[PDB]
Amino acid sequence: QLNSTEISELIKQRIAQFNVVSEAHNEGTIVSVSDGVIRIHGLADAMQGEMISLPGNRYAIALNLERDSVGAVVMGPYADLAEGMKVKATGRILEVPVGRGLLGRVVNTLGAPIDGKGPLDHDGFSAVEAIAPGVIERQSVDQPVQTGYKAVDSMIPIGRGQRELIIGDRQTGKTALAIDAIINQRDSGIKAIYVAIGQKASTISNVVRKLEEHGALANTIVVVATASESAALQYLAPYAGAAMGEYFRDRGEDALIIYDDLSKQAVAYRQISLLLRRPPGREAFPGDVFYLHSRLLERAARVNAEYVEAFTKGEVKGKTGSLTALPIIETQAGDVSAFVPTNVISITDGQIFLETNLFNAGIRPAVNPGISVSRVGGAAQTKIMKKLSGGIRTALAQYRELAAFSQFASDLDDATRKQLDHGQKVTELLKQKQYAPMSVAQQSLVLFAAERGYLADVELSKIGSFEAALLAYVDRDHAPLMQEINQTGGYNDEIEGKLKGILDSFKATQ
Amino acid sequence: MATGKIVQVIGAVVDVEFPQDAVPRVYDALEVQNGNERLVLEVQQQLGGGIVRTIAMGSSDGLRRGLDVKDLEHPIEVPVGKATLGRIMNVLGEPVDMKGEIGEEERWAIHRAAPSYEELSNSQELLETGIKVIDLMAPFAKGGKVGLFGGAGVGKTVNMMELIRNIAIEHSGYSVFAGVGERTREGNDFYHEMTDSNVIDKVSLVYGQMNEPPGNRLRVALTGLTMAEKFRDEGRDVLLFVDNIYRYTLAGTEVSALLGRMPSAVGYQPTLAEEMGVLQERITSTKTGSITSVQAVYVPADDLTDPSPATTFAHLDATVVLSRQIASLGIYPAVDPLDSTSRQLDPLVVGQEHYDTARGVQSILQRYQELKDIIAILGMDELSEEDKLVVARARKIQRFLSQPFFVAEVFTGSPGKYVSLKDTIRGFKGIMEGEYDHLPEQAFYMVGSIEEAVEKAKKL
Amino acid sequence: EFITVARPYAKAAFDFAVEHQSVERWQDMLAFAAEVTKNEQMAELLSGALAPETLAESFIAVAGEQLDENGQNLIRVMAENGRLNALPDVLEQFIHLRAVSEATAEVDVISAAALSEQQLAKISAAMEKRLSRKVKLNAKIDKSVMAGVIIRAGDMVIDGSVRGRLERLADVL
């Protein structure tokens, strides 16, 4: 036996006149405040997800509609709220500003700018919660997204509208890879959105500084929910970014959205659920934790021309649209069998495993092949890269087994010796410096050099200098070929012969 | 006239209060106006005082307390029959494609009892698929459950399409595909590929995407099962494809966690075994007809002792394993003959000849796998003349298992072949007994029956 | 026990009765409402899981001595939370709050034999200064104490019985 909102003055009011329903359903009063969650008495017309206006121009989201009171989470500072404060239910679902003006701006999950550069020009508002396009609306992904990393673009193609999970332990370069993929799209048609969940503000400021230094900030929208902000803001933040990205997808443009630390969003949602006393599941996560990530990630999709035409009322006809999502998941101790990692693995279309052992070793990108996979595969890849990358794939597959023989490779078949010294050189070639994305022409050129056996006589210690010298030489003497490759990505005998001439002419130097 | 009113909304769980003399029974369907659309609720528990507790079959956002609720007195009912073929439907039987209304003739409730002891078939019969590897090493029984353990890239979907085509054409049955927790992109790709292969008309597709609330993903299998049961009652033999039974188990776990029941070992729902049995026991061979099932299985941590695999395996009759290693050899279908198993492979079921042929093939392949280590470590010279014979025979057997599929003609450029059980049995018996030994090994690759192998050798 | 859940209802009812200057009628209504709860068939009815409104309307039917505008509201409020069984405790807490509001205290006196009026007067006079409230003594002399007297007010107890002295002396062992 315990009291359930049975307090003296409400009971006395009911004593005086039982039919208190005569008062408007539009308003209510706070009866409890704790840990950012408030209980509201009244609000007979409240609905799930409705925005409730609080004193001080704050808002709360109605999540638990109970038989006597409404449980709401404050989207901001809560310590000054007190019981007996009046609240009014605005009949609006959570909405955020959208439009092109947002580009280059830093905003919180509510769409309020925090960069200090004045108000936002925006093309209206969109609901934060939305339903992904149906099966019939989708179209198969066959268009490339270039990350600018040789390993990723070669073995792990990312297509426009694909979901590619970046997963790995702490301090392995996930954020670096994500932001470099953001940088590379600076000169392409793809527009980037970077969503920071639970990050400390200094890190976000540094990331924005690096984005502006290399000139990509003008093409990027930054949504920030720092670690000190209310858990509701952190949990809702990815959905706001998705809604901003959906603006371009439906109009017939391409967008790339990165969710940093989806595990932090899951932690915030677990906190919200437990403060609302919802039944816990495995590892204390609520029952619908899979639904949370699933409905978010399913928004990232490519839509056929007819969906775009219908949505824009025929103003855009020939263009398809796409939204590409790169969620980030942090494995604690290399455990991919945890709850949230398992769910995100099951949802996404591919995995890029970053390994701490390889990161400690010389290979800075630390991408681990043989465990990373892209289910879209060669359809996402340009013709030349698709032609070339199979050699790398098979070379690394062969090299993996011979690594056991590396300790005593002095006594081996010369064929095995060649395979080993080829795998080693390819692995040495795949390493790459941070903040230095390579165009498709340069990746294709170095991949051609590696595959066609031109590195056979080059020493393992000198591979990087060979690559740099080759890139400088081709940038100096043969720019038109690189321009054509970047424009088309085609491959034929007329191109292979030109590349052969390039490599023969370079090999006389250096 | 609506009679109930909503009293609680907590996520997907919706509580509705009815007059005490009109409380809906369990598993009944309710509907409410969620703004400008009808939202269906499934009754899960009858609480005291006329309050009922329901799981929303859709987005719960926008529901107000006090909304009127219409009590449909029947459980969720879906259209069934020939009209469903070539159509995509959700768990509620509404068309997901833009191809207009379904010309339904009947609507059936999805929750029904299993066939009685007296209705079950009085015999054990094999379902000849026409695929050499499957029909030989892992024979299907009618009404049996078959698990697919292969990964990705191993040709799983092409095998599914080939089975659909062979059952629709060589037999006179139909197929049902239940997309339990499908990815939307993969569902679209599967639909387009089935349209291209011209098998779409032969199969009925019901899709529950991952973005749906847990109730839809949990119930979507039952809709496909109901349509298959409709097809069976007409007297046909039916194939039921479940795209992931593991996602069915997970959806049941999520629903039970939402209802707040106490969890069980490794955190699964306490009703795991009964929820599995309810689905699996309806897939049986009735005197009127049979339903046969092929279910993709996933192992949560490669742990075969996990409660979900442990429960699933208790119902599986045969296991088919796909490996990328065999696909590297260009052999298709890429079915592993050493790990694929069927408990129908018994002399009292398939007869002595089939049993002996399969056991001989398996022993020869195991011996070859042993001798490959010797060949690699020490070279062919170590091999005796008897072991060279078994090596050559094993290579010829391993290449005879290849077969061109009618749906893969766009790949191989060769017409598909259908091989009866007796033909493949005779061919492998011949190869083992030492006839046809003189043919080149390439005469067996992708050939079909042995009578076509001798013809291919004549010009090879 | 319904002691903890009865408190808000008793407090609300007492404040309402004070604002309407009708405390005695409320006390009588509460006593009547507490008596019907003890009815054997009504006990089974209350134990059953009827809907709150039907149980309330059935309870109002058995009461025609209630001030409907306020008593019916009270009953319906308790019914909506299933607290109807708490009425015997709501009555007691209402009486307690009334006695606190009127600054009046009941005192029980136990002795080996009946006391004289002068002793009772001195006891009442001492207790009124001890509590700073008016007192009403009752005498419940006991067969077991052979001498002395016990004074109990609230839960504070003053013992002068010879039985208490005998036991307190043996404690020095």
Place this chain on the structure above:
Amino acid sequence: GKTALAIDAIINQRDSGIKAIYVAIGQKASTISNVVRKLEEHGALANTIVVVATASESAALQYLAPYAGAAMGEYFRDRGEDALIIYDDLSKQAVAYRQISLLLRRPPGREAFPGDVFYLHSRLLERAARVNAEYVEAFTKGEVKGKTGSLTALPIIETQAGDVSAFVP
């Protein structure tokens, strides 16, 4: 081969004058039907009682099965003749108590079984015993004299990965 070792025993008792009982708990209906057909084929069915609780039937039913079989065997045991009873998947019974128990909010113990799980099997198995002639005479009220009743039991338990050290085994 666990089920086979058992049914073979039932077939052997075809002429040994021992009654037989086969209790199927949580088994597939097709397998139960096939086992019944095999029992009828070799002529043992006329000497056996088959109690069936299919995999789809309510968990409650899947508990009075292995106790009803015990009572049916106890009839012969007390009458003074010999019976043999072979409970199938006593494990599939234990999973069912857990469901009825967890549905009743009873605190689970090791793994997820409730502490009463030992009492469940102990009270079911302990009924299989051989009773001296005096008990038979007392029960029969003097109708049967000098004969000792008996009830043999062959419980079946299924282990994951051959782990004999699990809780229920």
